[PDB]
Amino acid sequence: PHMSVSESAVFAYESSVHSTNVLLSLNDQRKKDVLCDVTVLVEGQRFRAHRSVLAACSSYFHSRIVGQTDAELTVTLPEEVTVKGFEPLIQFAYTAKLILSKDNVDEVCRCVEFLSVHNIEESCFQFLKFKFLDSTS
Amino acid sequence: PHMSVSESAVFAYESSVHSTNVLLSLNDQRKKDVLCDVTVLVEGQRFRAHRSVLAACSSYFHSRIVGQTDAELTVTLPEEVTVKGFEPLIQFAYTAKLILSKDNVDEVCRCVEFLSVHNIEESCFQFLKFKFLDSTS
């Protein structure tokens, strides 16, 4: 026949992969420009995104976004923000992974500070402790 | 002085908590009705959400949402969907945790199937193998 359990019992199911799947679906939506709702303009280049996600990940975006009413909102970032710095940064927001090398560490980390991208302040602090010189005592 | 690293080296940072934080920020946005963009109507009750998230988590929502143009989109679910079933279900989508007991298991799991809420089909299959009777041989 079947199995049974105490009448008052409560079942629970916690997925360890769900939140990551959701984030990756949003990243896929972002790369395809489907179901997005905001455009971020950096040096003439357009980055599509979800204002909800951007507000959640950056205090700067949060204040620029919250009371906005435009279905087709555009947020223009000043010169302090560059395509070279912002690119890997929005990629982090949507993938949880932040990549850096000699040529972008400074700009990527200046943007992190300038936009206050939460889960990354520390990392940048650590990466900025190095100089890409090539150990040759 | 400082530390250095090979000129060609590449730094990477993977956050294990970021995707969960993002999901919880979206859930907070959903409970407060701030930065949401879609309303789901179930038996006269309104559930605010992010169409991006709903499309990502449910095939049914995905087809009802994608080509929509309404900034203020409303998706009405038929009688098969009930507040008792849907409630813990949208909560799962936004928290990764699905709770169930004797009184909602059937409706919550009928909705999961009806809406095709990805990361939950199996769980429901397992929970439906039980009867809440109270083991008293």
UniProtKB/Swiss-Prot annotation, chains A, B:
It is found in: Nucleus. Disulfide bonds: none annotated. Ubiquitous. Coiled coil: none annotated. Residues 36-102 form the BTB domain. Ubiquitinated by the SCF(FBXL17) complex or by the by the SCF(FBXO22) complex, leading to its degradation by the proteasome. Under oxidative stress, reactive oxygen species covalently modify cysteine residues on the bZIP domain of BACH1 and release it from chromatin. If the BTB domain of BACH1 remains intact, its beta1-alpha6 degron is recognized by FBXO22, promoting its ubiquitination and degradation. Heterodimer of BACH1 and MAFK. Transcriptional regulator that acts as a repressor or activator, depending on the context. Binds to NF-E2 DNA binding sites. Plays important roles in coordinating transcription activation and repression by MAFK. Together with MAF, represses the transcription of genes under the control of the NFE2L2 oxidative stress pathway. Belongs to the bZIP family. CNC subfamily. This is Transcription regulator protein BACH1. The chain holds residues 1 to 135 of 739 of the full protein.
